[PDB]
Amino acid sequence: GWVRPDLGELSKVTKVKTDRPLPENPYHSRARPEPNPEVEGDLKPARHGSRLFFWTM
């Protein structure tokens, strides 16, 4: 009483009911490096300009 499957059936993606817990960190990675602080705050004008030797603006 076995039935040979149709074409395209054995390549279907099935769902599996498992009882083992999910691997929370399967790459066994350490903690990520902390990212650099972003930019924030209103962009004020440059204090006294270019400050390049004498150029006052």
Added chain:
Amino acid sequence: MLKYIIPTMMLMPLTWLSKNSMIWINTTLHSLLISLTSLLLLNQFGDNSLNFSLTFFSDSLSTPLLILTMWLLPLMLMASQHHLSKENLARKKLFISMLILLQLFLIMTFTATELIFFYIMFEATLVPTLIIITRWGNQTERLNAGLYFLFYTLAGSLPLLVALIYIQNTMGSLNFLILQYWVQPMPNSWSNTFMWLACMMAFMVKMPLYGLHLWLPKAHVEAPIAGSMVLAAILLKLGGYGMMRITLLLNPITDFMAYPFIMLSLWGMIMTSSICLRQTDLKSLIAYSSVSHMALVIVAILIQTPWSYMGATALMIAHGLTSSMLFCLANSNYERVHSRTMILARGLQTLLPLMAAWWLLASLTNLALPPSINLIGELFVVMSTFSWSNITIILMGLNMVITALYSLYMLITTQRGKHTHHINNILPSFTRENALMSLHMLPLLLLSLNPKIILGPLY
């Protein structure tokens, strides 16, 4: 200082829009109005320098150099136009544009609040001067006389450029107003020794120093009259102004690094005066006399006492007027005998009496006849160097003896004796030439009535 920088630039449309007969007259008139306007810089105070802006200021040192600079431009225009009578009109306007551009560079050279703007303007004054010399010169070797004058003022100012940016990163500023209050004493080290050399050698070349004076009698001889006037009166004095600004940052290493330079200057003011005794060329004699007089200014800045700075700035202003009048008198004879040989034209007082009186006055100011400001500067430098060391009075009085000798020898050789028989193109003195001599000499005699305006920041 913008009220002087803008009309100097307005002299460019005033010289490129005038009629073909009006370009000398308009530029002369409006540069005389600018020179009249320049007297507003005498708003000087006993404690606080006249500080205009973040870019420009004028204490009592830069103020007489500015008034001399803005006064010298009409005098150069009156002096240079007779030998440009056979000149093209557009080349004539380019000549006046180089003079106006040089004035524009100088009037914001001396008012440089910040030192790298002083460096840019200090090295930018060369290019109009170089164009005037190597384009309206006389002889074959005007290219060599302009080559070394570009070479020495860049090979000497290449350590000056490196040293100023080194202070920009260390002290954080090159504002001289800030650097009066944040100056650190410069300790004894070899690094600070080459720091002192980098700060001082460019201005030593510009004065000139003895041994480094080889560019100057060549460059004056290959120059026209406007180039000779501005070199004798302003462009040597750039080096004295720069040393008086730059020795603030160089203490106390100057008090033992000045000894070879003071010995060079003290022996060179003897040697160049003896060369002035042994000259055949009149313009070279005035050139070596200028080296002899600027050697005292180098000594007075290196000993850095108050009498020495007062005498050095008085001597710079006085020598500017005197040497400019001497080069103009040399031109007034080169426009008649067409050669610079001093023994060629003799006995000129029999022919040009009033011009001989102007020669007499210029030579008496050149030997520091009291109470002229030549004598005020000479005497104060001699007082301060007597305070430095009591045995310097031998070289000082010996230089004053030889100075009297070559000034009166120049006077006698051109103006006295039996005249040359085979010269007959000696025209009478023009009204232009006598006006030029009087505009040199009459302010130089009026400044003896009130010499306090030419005695610098520490009067």
